[PDB]
Each structure stands twice: as C-alpha cells, then as structure tokens.
C-alpha cells in the first residue's frame with residue numbers, strides 16, 4: 314500500500330462552485346469558459362511505482378499528466394497555457410502549483426468521506442469541485 318492509494322480510481326464530477334470566476338482570474342477567454350464550464354469530466358488517477366498519472370476526460374478536452382512528487386514538469390493546460398508544474402503531498406493533500414508568465418495558481422485534491430474534493434485558487438478567488446466514484 315502507498316502514498317496515494319485513496320486517490321486511485323475513476324471519479325466523476327458532481328458539483329462545482331465559482332468555477333467561472335476562477336477561470337476569469339486565470340485569464341481564460343469567454344468561449345473557452347462557457348464550453349469548459351459545461352463539461353462534466355471524469356478524472357482517472359493511477360500510480361505505477363513513483364509515477365502518478367492524472368487524466369481528465371470530457372467532451373471539452375482530454376488531458377493527461379504524469380509526474381513524480383516534488384519533481385517539476387512542463388504542462389499544457391486545458392485552456393492552452395504552457396505552465397511549469399510541481400505536485401507534492403502535504404499532509405495527505407495533493408498540492409499542484411502551476412507557474413506561467415509571472416503568475417501562479419494552486420489546485421489541491423483531497424479525499425473527504427467518499428468524495429474527492431478539488432480546490433482551485435487564483436489570487437483571492439477559490440473554486441471548489443466535488444467528484445464521486447464512477
């Protein structure tokens with residue numbers, strides 16, 4: 314058993330709050346916000362050795378990142394930002410920091426009851442997204 318066992322599996326989006334405002338703060342344009350905001354992604358998390366893979370799949374976009382905790386990687390986000398990312402575990406929470414153009418956003422993923430709860434923060438704006446097992 315290991316690090317991220319409680320995260321592994323297939324998850325489906327069940328609620329979102331303030332996601333449009335989070336995307337606005339990040340710089341996402343109108344049409345992308347509208348289509349991205351409609352999406353009901355599945356999130357698929359797997360672990361093989363030290364390598365964690367997170368896939369997001371929806372009618373809007375399919376994305377995939379693979380990484381080792383604490384080891385920076387380059388990421389193209391769903392809204393086409395080219396960012397440098399680092400993901401760590403901090404007290405059982407996966408903490409994902411993305412840096413680009415002198416800006417920074419943090420996405421936190423944690424297990425709470427039978428849910429996977431995602432908090433996205435850009436400056437003073439937070440969005441919360443709740444996933445359940447598929």
Ligand SMILES: O[S+](O)c1ccc(Oc2ccc(Cl)cc2)cc1
Pocket residue numbers: 336339341345346349356369390391392420431433442
């Ligand atoms: O659902 S959560 O894992 C999750 C994944 C990524 C994310 O950041 C986005 C997503 C879409 C756009 Cl268009 C811009 C930024 C926010 C939440």
